[PDB]
Structure formats: structure tokens, C-alpha cells
């Protein structure tokens, strides 16, 4: 089980997550749900996520990322999940 830091927790809650403690599988699930709630993926190139000007981009340190190269996402999670 992991406990997200507050900015990441707010993202998960905005996507429908409840509580403070999660499995990594649950964190990944609600990050995907957040990207869809905020409509951050490109409808015409659906592996591309454009997160500039969103809190998610601020945590990632990126304007965009691809689901085919999730390395910046994993770097963020390592920094923002307390295990």
C-alpha cells in the first residue's frame, strides 16, 4: 500500500478516488480516470496526453507525455508515493 502526497491525492480525488491509502494499481487506475475527466488526451492520437496548464503537468514537469513512454509518469510516482 502507498499514501500519495497531497497534490497527487487531490488529482486522484478529482477522478473519483476516496481515502488516503491505495495500492499502486488503484493509483494508476485513478490517474487514467483523471486524464479522461479533464480530457487531456488527444482524441486524434489517443496515447498522447497534453497536461500543460494542468496540475498534472506541474507534478510531471512536462507539457506532454505518451502512454508509450511512461517514464516521466513513473518518476513522478516514485517522488509522490510514500511506501
Amino acid at each position: 500500500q502507498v499514501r500519495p502526497k497531497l497534490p497527487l491525492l487531490k488529482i486522484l480525488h478529482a477522478a473519483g478516488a476516496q481515502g488516503e491509502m491505495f495500492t499502486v494499481k488503484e493509483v494508476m487506475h485513478y490517474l487514467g480516470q483523471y486524464i479522461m475527466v479533464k480530457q487531456l488526451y488527444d482524441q486524434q492520437e489517443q496515447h498522447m496526453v497534453y497536461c500543460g496548464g494542468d496540475l498534472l503537468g506541474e507534478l510531471l514537469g512536462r507539457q506532454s507525455f505518451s502512454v508509450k513512454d511512461p517514464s516521466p509518469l513513473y518518476d513522478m510516482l516514485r517522488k509522490n508515493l510514500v511506501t
Binding site: 494508476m28 487514467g32 486524464i35 479522461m36 488526451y41 489517443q46 496515447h47 502512454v67 511512461p70
Partner: peptide, 8 residues
Amino acid sequence: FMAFWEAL
């Protein structure tokens, strides 16, 4: 999107 995301 979800087809790709759930494949991680």
C-alpha cells in the same frame, strides 16, 4: 485512450 492506459 483507455485501451492504451490499461495496458501499462
